[PDB]
Amino acid sequence: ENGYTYEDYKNTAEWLLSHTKHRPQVAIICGSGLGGLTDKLTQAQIFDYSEIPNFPRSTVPGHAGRLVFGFLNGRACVMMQGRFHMYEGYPLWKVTFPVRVFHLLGVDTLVVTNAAGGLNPKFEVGDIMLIRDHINLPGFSGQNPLRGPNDERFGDRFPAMSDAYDRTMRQRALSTWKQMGEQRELQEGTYVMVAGPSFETVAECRVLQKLGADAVGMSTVPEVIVARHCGLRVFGFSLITNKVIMDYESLEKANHEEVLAAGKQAAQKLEQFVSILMASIPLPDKAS
Ligand SMILES: Nc1nc2c(c(=O)[nH]1)CC=N2
């Protein structure tokens, strides 16, 4: 919504449609460190957000501000590298502006990745959590991407979200993750979105864990809400990149010397895995 109108999204789509030979079926948003997925694209066309008519431009990081269209493993992707975050200052409706364009691009599935703080103790840095569900800690407050008036053209005024993280794919994913049989389990849980750019206190993590979130991060929910609101099929992962929770003993803090997750290897794993799943995303035109 706000800020943009339909015609904006349309133009944006059109420009991109009339500027890349590619029809992406799938959109992929990479969280921190899952940038590299873009390498796996074949026949990549890169746009700086930059060049795209309405696309929010990045707030600093920038290069890690790119939209690359590509084929990933039997699918017409379009991936965002460096998704936008509220805490950078966009409101939700620039954050999620792309999801709306990908729709108009034709994309019918979105897969969203983030990095996220492990709050379930079951979890070990490097883990991948497949997102079963989320808690929208900003939307409850007003900070929801679909807030202001609703374009019937993209979706219903009150989309449901109980089915957000599409179930079929949660399966193929869980199957697939055993298909190549790796060994720590493919995790699964609720991602709670928390906005702020700073990291949580211990009390904060308590409340988050006791709300039954398993991962905390700051992205995705808005993209997922706006995805689902125009019916994209969605799923995605968090790369657990750290965890805290207990008062006795800050032999440490909550920060970024813990958001590598072993480094490349965890991240690389998620990337393969995503690249693999390409294969499970139902084709569109017909598929059978
Ligand atoms: N809030 C919060 N967000 C995060 C992490 C964390 O430890 N806490 C890691 C990645 N995103």
From Swiss-Prot:
Pfam families: PNP_UDP_1
Reactions the enzyme catalyzes: inosine + phosphate = alpha-D-ribose 1-phosphate + hypoxanthine; guanosine + phosphate = alpha-D-ribose 1-phosphate + guanine; 2'-deoxyguanosine + phosphate = 2-deoxy-alpha-D-ribose 1-phosphate + guanine; 2'-deoxyinosine + phosphate = 2-deoxy-alpha-D-ribose 1-phosphate + hypoxanthine
Documented effect of changing E200 to A/Q: Severe loss of catalytic activity
Signal peptide: none
Keywords annotated in UniProt: Acetylation, Cytoplasm, Disease variant, Glycosyltransferase, Phosphoprotein, Purine salvage, Transferase
Annotated site, Important for substrate specificity, chain positions: N242
Positions annotated to bind phosphate: S32, H63, R83, F84, H85, A115, S219
Involved pathway(s): Purine metabolism; purine nucleoside salvage
Residues noted as binding a purine D-ribonucleoside in the record, renumbered to the chain: Y87, E200, M218, N242, H256
Localization, UniProt: Cytoplasm
Superkingdom field: Eukaryota
Classification via PROSITE patterns: PNP_MTAP_2
Binding partners and assembly: Homotrimer.
Family: Belongs to the PNP/MTAP phosphorylase family.
Disorder: Purine nucleoside phosphorylase deficiency: A disorder that interrupts both the catabolism of inosine into hypoxanthine and guanosine into guanine, and leads to the accumulation of guanosine, inosine, and their deoxified by-products. The main clinical presentation is recurrent infections due to severe T-cell immunodeficiency. Some patients also have neurologic impairment.
Protein name: Purine nucleoside phosphorylase
Organism: Homo sapiens
